[PDB]
Every structure is written in structure tokens, then in C-alpha cells.
């Protein structure tokens, strides 16, 4: 089989021009799609903030309308899902992963309009969920669609387009070209056997959707933190310590989110009316909270820059943390359409900033700025819950642009994945998929 | 399905045994790389020192510059040809082979040969890069601790070999990310599934990067300052630049390969004509490393200078041609030392050139040529070696102008596409494929 290898080596990197062109298209589409989804959620969140002014005096009358529209939008979303496409609830990242191992369907004719409008509902009412869930899943189907509509044949072309789509989807969600590509080749491809995903193809698709994003969002970064200070070597240990805390806590959080799905299922028993009401209940809570205590609701992106600067008290930071662990669970677990990715970054930052404050005070000789621990902690929860550190690390580096913290960032990430492994937690997506694949079988 | 559920719930459980061993592999490879780094400095220094002792009498100095580059060149070409022929050239191809389990990993031989051999070739100012030596050296360090500790298993063998090569690259450019990415882009068995543990690779890299920062802290290999931005009405120019590197990348591969062929005839495989021809080329280098410094050397020096746009356009064309010549001569002649670094230098110079033209055909775009330099820097790595993701990241880690990520990506992709469509192969897969055939043939 040596001869056989000389045959493949000399043949390497020859992805059919057919598939390369289709990636371009997939990326462009997924990009636009994501841009549009992005705009919708802004609009709806803005209406809600508009209506709130119109009832600015009567206080309980205002707390009322904040709830009732988030409630109405949540419901509208939970419904579109439960009725027309149950497989597009929760994240959908686990679902696209299954598609790659060829173990779940890719019902685009259903998912596309459901995930899109459904999330537009849940996200738009200020629920604690992330744009990426909808965009990553949405993107995978857009890649399925152009594979069907163009009747492209062969394992390569099917796995490749489904991949470039999911990439372009993430890329467009954070304006993160690299994170997107890295996502496919770290956590997205079939994890146990070889696959024929063309990385060049993924590239084009991401390039296209990043352009599309930049054409409409140009000149305003999702997060803007300024250039933070540096990291002396006699400081690196502190980041390892921070990694361990995330590592013992990452697995716990996973238990919680899973058990929480189980527990919330008893409330509606699987019943589409108790669900859609319980959904509008949680959603209503969010829009109310998005007004009386705004940092406990929402996606989370607003308070990153605030926490990193060190503008929250320690008490406030503890508050925000607890409040958000509660709302992030409540929203994702209850199977609303929308990812868990983004709110995790938020918890990381807040936790890290907290550690940072303590750190800064026990070690004045180190001349610390708590805002670095915030950045090292930001993608740390993704490292211990998700178990895709390389991807989380690069994602943060593309959004916070303080490359000088690359060593601490890495050390905290590795600190997390190690202690998440040694305290027995599984990758929260492989876990979710594993439940789904059993849930299919266990009842036959 | 009942099979997959089993694997999913079992994923990411690399034995603590292997994770610990990664840490030591990295630490070792780090130190080794640090030491190698220092040696080449020292030897280059002596050459500059002795050069002053003979500062008057011009032809007498041009003589000493040659003779010790010559003497050091030969010393290296020998250590290889005699005690470990498999450690000539890059060794990146040789480690890649080790992963497919198709080449041996003679560390007891390679370690001391590559190390001292390169210290020879590099130290005399030859146009080769530190990474060749370090990457290969790193794999063997990983082989060594696998043997010396008798670790059993396919995983533990493939993993240590990998993390070693990673920590090897990492320490070569203070590039933790580029390191890891290298393994999972261009270094793992490309066609079948393997059991390399990415977590282990991580630890190894962290350890060697710490080692490097412990001794080199407070001075970046390349320093360019924060260049300007990239308007969207400008991206097309980067795609164009990608295409030029894409038609040229395959050409270069032809040249380097055919050059290996051609240089073999001059010595016929004969260890004496080789070592002489080696000290010849190496002599040439240290002479040039004085009379026209930018044509010789690793190349890192002129990046900052070219990116600032301090070279004339004439000078840039000169540097380019001169270097295409010396880079071929040096790597093709099997001298121990990688081809990575000098490639970065060519890209920069080529890009900066394009930049200048670009800047005066489009004053409305308000261009700064220095960005085309940076987008072109890892473009040659994209079209010759064909690992763009790894090249792109590497540059980003050394130049730190993340704001150019899109143009960088576009030029990269522009290259890999046109290298594909004009028939070139991955220069590393090509070299390996020559070696394996030259074996069963």
C-alpha cells in the first residue's frame, strides 16, 4: 500500500471545479441570509423598544407590554417549530453535525423558513440565545438546497457543501472568517472516520459570506474592547488556574443544560400547546427582564466591552453571572430555536473579569489589568462545555483582536479542556446528538 | 448508529499517559530549538567578527567571508551524507512520511546530525530556514521519548511524533497557532483516518512556546507596525495578486524539483563532490552575505524593510531574482535546512512590488503597498506548499495586522486555486512521493 500512497500523494488537493463554484454560491446565499436574519432581529428589538416608550408613564402598564410582545414573539416562534419542523429547535448545530455522519435528515424545505422566522421570533423578543444557532443550521440547509436544486452527485460534494454552508453560517454570525473554517475542521466533521470535505471549498464559501456580511455591516465591530495590556511570564500560572475553574464548571453546566431539557419536558409533556405557552412564558420573562435588569437578558454582546473595561462592581458581576446562568438555561433548554454559543462567551467574560478583579488585588506586584482575564475567560466556557478550544480561541482573537494574549488565552483554554476531560464531561454537542440518536432508537 | 452513539459519548479521552508525555516533548523541542537559534547567531557573529579583522585589503576580506561559510557549509553537508542522509533538505517531507508509517525515525542519528549540520549551513549565512531543522528535530524528540519510555500504541506513536513537529514549528516562529494548525492541515496522514490527539499537540506547543518566550522575550522576529486598512473596493486587487502567485507557485515547484535532479549530476551521489559543492554554494552565500546582503541570509531582515516600501522598484526586482537563484541553489542542493522562511521573504518582496504598481494605478484607493506585502507574504506558501490556512495564520501571528485577514485570505485562496488549475502539487507531498518511489523503484 506504499505504491497506493504515491498514487494519492501526487493526486492531492484536486477538488472538482464543479464543487468549488457551488461553494461560492452557498457562501453568498448563507451570507445574505445571515445578513437578513441579523437585520430582522434588530428591527423587532427596536419595535419593542419603541412600543415601550409609548407606555412610558403607567409603570405596570409598561412592564406589561415589555412582557406581552416578547411573549407573543416567543410563542410565534415555538409554534413555527413544534408544528412545522421539530428538528429545528434548540441549537441545530448538533443536528447539522448528525447530517455529516449521515444520521439525520436535512429537510431544508422545512427548516429554512422555520428556523429563520422562528428564531427571528425568539431572538427578536430579547431571549438569551445566539444568532449562530439559526445561521449555522440555516447555512447547512442552504448548502443542501443548492446540492439538490443542482442535482450534484457524490459523497464529496454532499459533505463539502453541507460543510461550507455551516461555515459561512458561523463566519457570518461573528464576522469571523477563520473561526468558521476552523469550526469545520475541529468540531464539525465526522469525528471518527475519514471524510471527503474539501477545505478549499469551505474557504470560498466563507470568503463569500464574509464579504456579504462586510457589505452591510461595515465599520462597526460586534465587540470592541480596545488594545488591553500585556502578559508577563510570571503571570501565566494565574491563567492556568482560571482554566481549571472553567474545567470543573464546564461539565457541571452541561449536566444542568441537559437535565434542564429533561425537566422542562415534564411541564408541557410534549404537548404543542403547553409548549408554545411555556415558550411564550419564558420569552415574556426575557423582554420584561430586558428592561428591569438588561444585563440578565439579551444575547450578551453588550456587556462584554463593559465588563472587560472593569466597569461592573464585583457584586454586580456575581449578580449578572447567576442571573444569566439561570436565563441561559431557561432559554436554550426549553428548545427555543437559537444557539447557546453567544451567551456562553458572555458568561466567560463575566466570570473571567471576576477572577481578574480578585487576581488584581492579591497581586499588585504583577500590575494586572482584570480585562485580560476577561478575554482569557471569554472563550473558556466554550472550551470546557463545547470542547472545541481551538475554535473558541480563534473566534475570540478575531473579535477582540488582542493577539498579545494568545498565550494566556491558550493556557486557559487547555486548562479547561483538560479538567473537563478529567472530571468526566462530554462535548455538549456530541452529547446532544447522542441523546437524539438514541431517542430515535430507544422507541422501536 | 448504536455504534456511533457509543463513540460520541466516548469522544476526547486521550490517556493522561500521552498528555504528560506531550508536555515533555514540547519542553525538550522548545529548548532544542532555543539552543539551535543561539548557535546560528553565534556562528554568524564570528563570521562578522573575523570579517572586521580583515577589514582593509578588500579581496582578503571577501576571501575570509567565503572560506568560513565554505568551511561551515562543508561541515554540515558531511555530517549528513556520512551519518544520516535522510536529514538533508527540509525533513518536513521525511516527518510527513513517518506519520503514514512509510519512513523510519532514526533519532539516534538524526538529532545530532540535523542539529549540528544545520548549525553549519545556517550559521554560514545560507538561504535556508530554521524550521526545517526544528520541525524534524522535533519529531525525533517525540520519537525518542516514546522509545525511552516504551509507550505502546498507534495513538501514542502518531501523537508524540506530531506534537513534536508542532512544538518544532511553534518554536521556530513563536507561532503557537500556526504550529497546531500545521499538524491538522498539512501534516497528518492525508488520506486515511488517524488517531492524533489535538489536545496533546496543544500541550506540546504551549510548552515549547513558553520555552521560546523564556529566552527570546521582548523582541519579535518580524516587526511591521500596524499597517493601514482594506476598503472593499480594493479586495479585487488581492485576488489578482493571488493569481500571479498561483501561476508562479507551480513553476517554482518544477524548478526546485528539477534543480535537485540537476545538482545530483554534478556530484553523482559522491560524498566528496557533494561536500565540496556544498561548501561551494555555502561559500557563495557568505560572500554575498556581505556584498549584497539581501540576496543571502534567511530573509527575515528585509521583510520589515520591504513592507515599509523602502526599496526601490528596481531593487525589489533585483532582490527577487537574486533570491530565487540562491534559494533554489541552497535547498535543492540537499543542504540541511528548510525552505519555509525564504519563501516568506519572496512573497513579501513580490507582494511589495505588486503593491507599488497598484499604488500608482489607483491613487483613488489610497493604497499603502505594505499591505500587498503582507497578503503576499504567505502567498508563496499557499501556491507552492499548498497549506494556505497554515500560512495565513502564521503570517497573522508574526505581523499582527488582523485587519488584513480578508485580503490575506483572498490572496491565499487565489493562489491555491490557480496552483490547482495549472497542475502543481504540494511541494511536500511531491518530495515525499519522489522519496517513496525512489524506494520501491
Amino acid at each position, epitope marked *: 500500500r506504499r505504491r497506493q500512497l504515491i498514487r494519492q500523494l501526487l493526486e492531492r488537493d484536486k477538488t472538482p471545479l464543479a464543487i468549488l463554484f457551488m461553494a461560492a454560491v452557498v457562501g453568498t446565499l448563507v451570507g445574505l441570509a445571515a445578513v437578513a436574519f441579523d437585520k430582522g432581529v434588530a428591527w423587532l428589538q427596536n419595535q419593542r423598544m419603541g412600543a415601550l416608550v409609548h407606555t412610558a408613564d403607567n409603570y405596570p402598564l409598561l412592564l406589561t407590554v415589555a412582557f406581552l410582545c416578547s411573549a407573543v414573539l416567543a410563542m410565534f416562534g415555538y409554534f413555527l417549530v413544534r408544528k412545522y419542523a421539530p428538528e429545528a429547535g434548540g441549537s441545530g448545530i448538533p443536528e447539522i453535525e448528525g447530517a455529516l455522519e449521515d444520521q439525520r435528515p436535512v429537510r431544508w424545505w422545512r427548516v429554512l423558513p422555520v428556523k429563520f422566522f422562528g428564531g427571528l421570533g425568539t431572538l427578536g423578543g430579547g431571549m438569551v440565545l445566539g444568532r449562530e444557532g439559526p445561521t449555522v443550521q440555516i447555512g447547512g440547509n442552504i448548502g443542501r438546497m443548492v446540492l439538490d436544486i443542482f442535482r450534484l452527485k457524490g459523497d464529496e460534494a454532499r459533505h463539502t457543501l453541507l460543510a461550507t454552508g455551516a461555515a459561512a453560517g458561523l463566519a457570518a454570525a461573528f464576522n469571523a472568517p477563520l473561526a468558521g473554517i476552523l469550526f469545520i475542521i475541529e468540531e464539525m466533521r465526522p469525528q471518527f472516520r475519514y471524510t471527503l470535505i474539501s477545505i478549499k471549498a469551505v474557504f470560498i464559501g466563507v470568503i463569500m459570506s464574509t464579504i456579504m456580511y462586510r*457589505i452591510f455591516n*461595515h465599520e462597526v465591530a460586534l465587540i470592541d474592547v480596545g488594545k488591553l495590556s500585556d502578559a508577563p511570564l510570571n503571570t501565566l500560572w494565574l491563567y492556568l488556574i482560571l482554566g481549571i475553574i472553567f474545567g470543573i464548571f464546564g461539565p457541571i453546566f452541561n449536566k444542568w443544560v441537559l437535565g434542564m431539557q429533561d425537566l422542562l419536558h415534564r411541564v408541557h409533556g410534549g404537548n404543542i400547546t403547553k409548549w408554545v405557552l411555556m415558550g411564550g412564558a419564558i420569552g415574556g420573562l426575557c423582554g420584561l427582564l430586558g428592561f428591569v435588569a438588561p444585563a440578565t437578558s439579551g444575547g450578551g454582546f453588550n456587556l462584554i466591552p463593559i465588563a472587560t473595561a472593569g466597569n461592573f462592581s464585583m457584586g454586580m458581576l456575581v449578580f449578572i453571572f447567576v442571573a444569566r446562568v439561570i436565563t441561559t438555561l431557561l432559554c436554550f433548554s426549553s428548545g427555543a430555536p437559537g444557539g447557546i454559543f453567544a451567551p456562553m462567551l458572555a458568561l466567560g467574560t463575566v466570570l473571567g473579569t471576576a477572577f481578574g478583579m480578585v487576581a488584581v488585588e492579591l497581586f499588585p506586584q504583577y500590575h494586572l489589568e482584570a480585562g485580560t482575564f476577561a478575554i482569557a475567560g471569554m472563550g473558556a466556557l466554550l472550551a470546557a462545555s463545547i470542547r472545541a478550544p481551538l475554535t473558541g480561541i480563534i473566534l475570540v482573537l478575531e473579535m477582540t483582536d488582542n493577539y498579545q494574549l494568545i498565550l494566556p488565552m491558550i493556557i486557559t483554554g487547555l486548562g479547561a479542556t483538560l479538567l473537563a476531560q478529567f472530571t468526566g464531561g462530554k462535548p455538549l454537542w456530541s452529547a446532544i446528538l447522542a441523546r437524539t440518536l438514541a431517542k430515535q432508537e430507544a422507541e422501536q | 448508529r448504536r455504534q456511533l452513539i457509543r463513540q460520541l459519548l466516548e469522544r476526547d479521552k486521550t490517556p493522561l499517559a500521552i498528555l504528560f508525555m506531550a508536555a515533555v516533548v514540547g519542553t525538550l523541542v522548545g529548548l532544542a530549538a532555543v539552543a539551535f537559534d543561539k548557535g546560528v547567531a553565534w556562528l554568524q557573529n564570528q563570521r562578522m567578527g573575523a570579517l572586521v579583522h580583515t577589514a582593509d585589503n578588500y579581496p582578503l576580506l571577501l576571501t575570509v567571508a567565503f572560506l568560513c561559510s565554505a568551511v561551515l557549509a562543508m561541515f554540515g553537508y558531511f555530517l549528513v551524507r556520512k551519518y544520516a542522509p535522510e536529514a538533508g533538505g527540509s525533513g518536513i517531507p521525511e516527518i510527513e512520511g513517518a506519520l503514514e508509517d512509510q519512513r523510519p525515525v532514526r533519532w539516534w542519528r538524526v538529532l545530532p546530525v540535523k542539529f549540528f549540520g544545520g548549525l553549519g549551513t545556517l550559521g554560514g549565512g545560507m538561504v535556508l530556514g530554521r524550521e526545517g531543522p526544528t520541525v524534524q528535530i522535533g519529531g525525533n524528540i517525540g520519537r525518542m521519548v516514546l522509545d525511552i519510555f516504551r509507550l505502546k500504541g498507534d495513538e501514542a506513536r502518531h501523537t508524540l511524533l506530531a506534537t513534536g513537529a508542532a512544538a518544532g514549528l511553534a518554536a521556530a516562529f513563536n507561532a503557537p497557532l500556526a504550529g497546531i494548525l500545521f499538524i491538522i492541515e498539512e501534516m497528518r496522514p492525508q488520506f486515511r483516518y488517524t488517531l492524533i490527539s489535538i489536545k496533546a499537540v496543544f500541550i506540546g506547543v504551549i510548552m515549547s512556546t513558553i520555552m521560546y518566550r523564556i529566552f527570546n522575550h521582548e523582541v519579535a522576529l518580524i516587526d511591521v507596525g500596524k499597517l*493601514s486598512d482594506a*476598503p*472593499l*473596493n*480594493t479586495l479585487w486587487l488581492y485576488l489578482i495578486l493571488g493569481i500571479i502567485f498561483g501561476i508562479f507557485g507551480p513553476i517554482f515547484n518544477k524548478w526546485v524539483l528539477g534543480m535537485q535532479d540537476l545538482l545530483h549530476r554534478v556530484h553523482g551521489g559522491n560524498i566528496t563532490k557533494w561536500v565540496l559543492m556544498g561548501g561551494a554554494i555555502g561559500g557563495l552565500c557568505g560572500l554575498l552575505g556581505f556584498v549584497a546582503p539581501a540576496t543571502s541570509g534567511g530573509g527575515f531582515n528585509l521583510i520589515p524593510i520591504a513592507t515599509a*516600501g523602502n526599496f526601490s522598484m528596481g531593487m525589489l526586482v533585483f532582490i527577487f531574482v537574486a533570491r530565487v537563484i540562491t534559494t533554489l541553489l541552497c535547498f535543492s542542493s540537499g543542504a540541511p535546512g528548510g525552505i519555509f522562511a525564504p519563501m516568506l521573504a519572496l512573497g513579501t518582496v513580490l507582494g511589495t512590488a505588486f503593491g507599488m504598481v497598484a*499604488v500608482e494605478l489607483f*491613487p*483613488q*484607493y*489610497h493604497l*499603502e503597498a505594505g499591505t500587498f506585502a503582507i497578503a503576499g507574504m504567505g502567498a508563496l506558501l499557499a501556491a507552492s506548499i499548498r497549506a494556505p490556512l497554515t500560512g495565513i495564520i502564521l503570517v497573522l501571528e508574526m505581523t499582527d495586522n488582523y485587519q488584513l485577514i480578508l485580503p490575506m485570505i483572498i490572496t491565499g485562496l487565489g493562489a491555491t486555486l490557480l496552483a490547482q488549475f495549472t497542475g502543481g502539487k504540494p511541494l511536500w507531498s511531491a518530495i515525499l512521493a519522489r522519496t517513496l518511489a525512489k524506494q520501491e523503484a
Partner: antibody
Amino acid sequence: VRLLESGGGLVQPGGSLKLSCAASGFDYSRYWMSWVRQAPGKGLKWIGEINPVSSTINYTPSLKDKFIISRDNAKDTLYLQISKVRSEDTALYYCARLYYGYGYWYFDVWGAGTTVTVSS
Amino acid sequence: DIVLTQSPAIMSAAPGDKVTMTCSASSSVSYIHWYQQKSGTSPKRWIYDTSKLTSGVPVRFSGSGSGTSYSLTINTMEAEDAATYYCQQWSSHPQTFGGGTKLEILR
């Protein structure tokens, strides 16, 4: 974010003058700077643009040194020497900070203006 | 260097009125910018890349065009709009400014 230009007034026909524009509010490297002018009750005529690293300098069609646009990043200040001055130079001079949208470039934040009066 | 000329040099119109000045250019330009020079103040980036609005510019403002002609439009002009308005291209070099349209309010 403000630009505050200065040093205009009376000049002898034929003599020269250095207008200084001090910037504040924003990082003054990073930015191309420019000068536009307006003669009384008329239109905006562009003069020159200097880049951040003082390496590219462009000018409206003009002769040898009619204009010289320097800048000194140590002081966040732009300058503009005007030479051999004829009465067509009598105008208000704006210092304006450059920037792009999709990439066709615009005069982002404008100064307040200094007035140059060519006379005996 | 592109010669830009502006529709009405001076044009009256009573608040409420939908109002449209024009920028027509000698050769072919694209993505143009519009400045507002209120009387006695300095010019202000108003509309940029032909129809995107500088921040804080009231939505009553619109831009469009292509080719050799562009227009800036106020849908229900309000009295505070009284100004000279300039258009400016930099799609070729050097850049160039319009001649101005001077909006006047009827009351």
C-alpha cells in the same frame, strides 16, 4: 473630536504662509489628512492630502511648490505652506480628516476654517 | 478631472414639498458624497456612497443615482433644511466637488 486650524490673515502678494491645524479627540496617525478651500461665496476646491506616514502627498494641479502639505504626528498637527501668493488664494481654508465608505473616499470631519486675505 | 454640475443652482420650496436636487458629471462617476453647508457653518458629511446617510441625518433625506447623474432628495423638506448642498466624487482622481444647490424656504 475636533479640528482647529490657524495662522491665516494678511499676506503680501508674493509672500508665503504656514497654516497649522491642530487635531484632538481622535488618534491622529491612522488617518489621512486633507485641506480644502472656499473663496468667498463660492465652492469647495480640494488642495492636498497627506497620509499618516508622511510618505504619500498629493495636490490639485499646481506648480513646483505653490503648496507644501506637511504634518507632524508628535503634535497631531497638519500644515500647509502656500508660496508666491496671488489673489486667487484669498479664501477660507478647511482642514478635514479623510475616510472611506465602501472605499470611495470622503472628507469625514471638517475643521472650522482659517481665512487668508491676499492684500497690500 | 471629472466636471460635476449641480441641478438647480438655487431652488425655493415650502416645507411639506418633496424636493430633489441633481448632480450630473461630465465623465462617469460612482458612489458619490453629499455635503450640507448651512449658512455660516462648515460643511458636514450628509450622504455618502450615493445613498447611505451620515449618522444623525434625519431620515427625511434620500440619495440615489448612477452613471453620470445623481440626485439627493428630501421627502417632505423641513425649514431647517435651508443650506447650500454640495456633491463630491472621488471615484477618479483628483476628487471633485459640485457647484452647489442653495435650498431656500418659502414661508
